[PDB]
Amino acid sequence: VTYKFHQYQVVGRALPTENDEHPKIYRMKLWATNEVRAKSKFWYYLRKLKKVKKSNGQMLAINEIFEKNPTKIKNYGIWLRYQSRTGYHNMYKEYRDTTLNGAVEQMYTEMASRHRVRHHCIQIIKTATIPAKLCKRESTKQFHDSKIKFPLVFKKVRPPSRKLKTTYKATRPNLFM
RNA sequence: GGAUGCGAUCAUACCAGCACUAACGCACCGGAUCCCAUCAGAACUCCGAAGUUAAGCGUGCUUGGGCGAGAGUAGUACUAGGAUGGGUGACCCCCUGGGAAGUCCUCGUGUUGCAUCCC
Length: 177
Ligand SMILES: [Mg+2]
Ligand SMILES: [Mg+2]
Description:
It comes from Nicotiana tabacum. The protein is of the alpha+beta class. Helices cover about 20% and strands about 30% of the residues. The radius of gyration is 22 Å and the shape is elongated. The structure holds one RNA strand.
């Protein structure tokens, strides 16, 4: 099981000094492809929001967060702010996936596809597991059906592997739903 | 705890308005023959000790001005380096780093060297 995006809890503080023997300890929940990039973004946010630089700061702890039950489907809501070609905007989106990592990957892909927003232009404000009744988007609410039933409208025809691939076939494919 | 003479730093020491000061001092102060000096014994110079702490000098107060320190402004403005980064462009996001200044708020209003003297 490999996820492109991982969730980390990064803990850090400003370097102790004479004035502050025990400086405030700050924690963040961040998304990054690696722990190194997670720490980089943690220090970026600490510098921008608390005036604590990496040079005069201390790294305390970093742990990965894994989905409790990756075997079941959940509804995930993501509150984010992104930058467009003309300014900044806030955005709330909903996704269905077995893990929040998959939901975040879907969020990045959808932002790229629909708004041409690159990964570095997106800040995640909040994440949460939404119950079915509290979902706001029709896209997620359409699969909240006890008896869900539909045919496979679009299926791509291919051999099990390229071993059986042939340029020529005697008959055209026979497709039906 | 001060004053005076000579200073160091050269406003936390400056400016303005009020109040106060034992002693020695420092002063104000009395004269113009002499040295000296002017329109003017005002100033400067010389000779004094009648009177006064009225002023100067010193100290204290002002929700005072200024001055000095901090907080904040603000990881903002700006900026060194990177990108086959976004954008038509103007410009701008992001990565590796550095990082200010008014307004507003709080505090403080000198510290000292040598010598003589009073207490
Ligand atoms: Mg007097
Ligand atoms: Mg003042």
